[PDB]
Design a protein around this motif. Structure first.
Motif, short mmCIF file in Angstrom:
data_model
loop_
_atom_site.label_atom_id
_atom_site.label_comp_id
_atom_site.label_asym_id
_atom_site.label_seq_id
_atom_site.Cartn_x
_atom_site.Cartn_y
_atom_site.Cartn_z
N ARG C 18 0.84 -1.19 0.00
CA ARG C 18 0.00 0.00 0.00
C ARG C 18 0.87 1.24 0.00
NH1 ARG C 18 -2.73 -3.14 3.79
NH2 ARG C 18 -1.83 -1.94 5.53
N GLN C 19 1.92 1.34 0.89
CA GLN C 19 2.78 2.50 0.99
C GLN C 19 3.51 2.79 -0.31
OE1 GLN C 19 2.67 4.29 3.87
NE2 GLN C 19 3.91 5.90 2.94
N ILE C 20 3.92 1.75 -1.04
CA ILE C 20 4.55 1.95 -2.33
C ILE C 20 3.60 2.73 -3.24
CG2 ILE C 20 5.27 0.72 -4.45
CD1 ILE C 20 6.40 -1.49 -2.45
N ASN C 21 2.34 2.31 -3.28
CA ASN C 21 1.37 2.99 -4.13
C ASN C 21 1.19 4.45 -3.71
OD1 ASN C 21 -1.76 3.66 -4.90
ND2 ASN C 21 -0.74 2.43 -6.45
N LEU C 22 1.16 4.71 -2.40
CA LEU C 22 0.97 6.07 -1.91
C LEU C 22 2.16 6.97 -2.30
CD1 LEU C 22 -0.73 8.09 -0.35
CD2 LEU C 22 0.29 7.22 1.74
N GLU C 23 3.39 6.44 -2.21
CA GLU C 23 4.56 7.23 -2.58
C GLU C 23 4.57 7.50 -4.10
OE1 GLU C 23 6.32 7.18 1.50
OE2 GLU C 23 6.68 8.50 -0.31
N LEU C 24 4.17 6.52 -4.90
CA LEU C 24 4.04 6.74 -6.34
C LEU C 24 2.96 7.77 -6.68
CD1 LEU C 24 4.44 3.06 -7.54
CD2 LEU C 24 6.12 4.92 -7.85
N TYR C 25 1.84 7.72 -5.95
CA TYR C 25 0.80 8.73 -6.09
C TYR C 25 1.33 10.12 -5.73
CZ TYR C 25 -3.37 11.44 -5.06
OH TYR C 25 -4.31 12.41 -5.00
N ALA C 26 2.04 10.25 -4.61
CA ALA C 26 2.61 11.53 -4.22
C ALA C 26 3.56 12.06 -5.30
CB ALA C 26 3.31 11.44 -2.87
N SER C 27 4.39 11.17 -5.88
CA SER C 27 5.29 11.58 -6.94
C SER C 27 4.48 12.19 -8.10
CB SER C 27 6.10 10.38 -7.40
OG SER C 27 6.96 10.76 -8.45
#
Ligand SMILES: [Fe+3]
Lengths: 172, 172, 172, 172
Positions: C18-27
């Protein structure tokens, strides 16, 4: 007790002494492996170099735990260093598998030590273990798993060129 | 419209937005591939490095199209970046074949964009695509085809040493 | 499971994905912001540079979590990267306020991940989050709060020179 | 005709002569602007420097078209260089707006020249225009649009500090 001692449980002291012995044992296992690959009938110099490096690293881990014990005002009590479980490690692949098993057993011991430090509310000891032991162990385990995977795929030990070429390319 | 806009068709603007999304998607596919080769049961570090480089390159392509859109006075509209078609890429050979297919699909999109720019008499956009996209794609496709050819000849993936030695010699 | 896996809960694996997806979203959000400031009708080059840097940093955070997942013997499962909530970010001040909100939401997710790691007695994962994520987030949040404060005091966005001079002096 | 001439239409030759005159005219307009900002009652040295640079660049564009005409075996026919439409450019913002309009008119002429070259199947001339003229014009137009946007936001020309601070920060 010691003039420096503060917030350092007798259980933790005992567990650190145990961990010192385990790191010294691991160093000795690696030394045994290193020697094996130096035999004239095995003759894989980069496997030998790899395991000798690991032996020297595990000694350094032991010495850093000794420094911690004295920094916290505990007292080091040494025990016999048991001989490794075998003299003949059979193959590069088997030695890497045995190393992976050993590294996981050392990691398990460190996780039990962290749990003890957490229970006894010893944040300096918790931080020490993490900072210098837990990430090193995860890195070691992943590296050994990668080596085992590659050797297996290449056909080791039955494919005669596999350990030879792995010694050259990965360990050289 | 924008004070800078001149000779820039609404169709072209829309097609550039689509291309931005496709380049971001390609970057994400490459990232997925890179990760796969980093698994402990795959453990091919130079395949991982190769695909991570490709991921970073495709992002750069996307960012250059964004710069173009603003330079011409169009407006960037972003869309969701869809997840790649798979999580497990099976083998070095299969990932290279999938990459070749992806690069050809991106090339096809760029050729359709050039045809649109030609139809709308937009020479700056035609020149941009060629100068920065079409020769890069041809080079990429040829490199991936060469990699696929070599891996197939070497016996990948069934010949266990093939991907290992290709990782060392071609990608290292 | 994986030969390397030790003390790594399935819940933690899922939370890392989940956190990977959130960091990619933030990028992706940062990339959208960066583009906005590159428009000819906005034209604040140092705001654009600032948000592009943040975009690249958040990608790096994502890639480091991917490396962790593989180091611990988890498996990466990627999901769609959703498009940002808007295309037009209105002003330098509004973008900084939106960035502050985003950074706080990412921090909240990381604090929930740390709580999970603590519950599952996973000290390596707890240490990883702190060492590479929690202090970076606190620093980011404080920097964005300082930027918002300064822009508000200067009179942004209604005082026309405020964003211009902030772009020159603080972000240049 | 000329011993070197090949695939070079009389229409194209005539259109190149026209473009030479337009680039010389643009150089003269920029020179007029540069001078204006050098007046004691205007006194914006970095506006003056910016427009003098643009004047020198447009001359260089003209000289490169002259070189092309001779390379293709056409003959250069010069015409009068008309005086600029005004002597007093009123403000930094007004001069930038007038420059944007001029650059767009030069771009339109270049797009008409490319269309002619395309019609006459003259790929060398098409490539020349793109390679050395069309991307430069797009870059110029975007830069001038950004300058106009910033000056307007800052409050120019009525806000007295706007052109002063823009001269220092953006053009200095
Ligand atoms: Fe070889």
């Amino acid at each position: 007790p010691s003039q420096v001692r503060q917030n350092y449980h007798q259980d933790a002291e005992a567990a650190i002494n145990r961990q010192i012995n385990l790191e010294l044992y691991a160093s000795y296992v690696y030394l045994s492996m290193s020697c094996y690959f130096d035999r004239d009938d095995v003759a894989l110099k980069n496997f030998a170099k790899y395991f000798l490096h690991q032996s020297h690293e595990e000694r350094e881990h032991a010495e850093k735990l000794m420094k911690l014990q004295n920094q916290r005002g505990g007292r080091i009590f040494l025990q016999d260093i048991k001989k490794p479980d075998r003299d003949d490690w059979e193959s590069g692949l088997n030695a890497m598998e045995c190393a992976l098993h050993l590294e996981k057993s050392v990691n398990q011991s460190l996780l039990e030590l962290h749990k003890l430090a957490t229970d006894k509310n010893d944040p300096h000891l918790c931080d020490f273990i993490e900072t210098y032991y837990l990430s090193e162990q995860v890195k070691s385990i992943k590296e050994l798993g990668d080596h085992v995977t590659n050797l297996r795929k290449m056909g080791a030990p039955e494919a005669g060129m596999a350990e030879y070429l792995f010694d050259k390319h990965t360990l050289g």
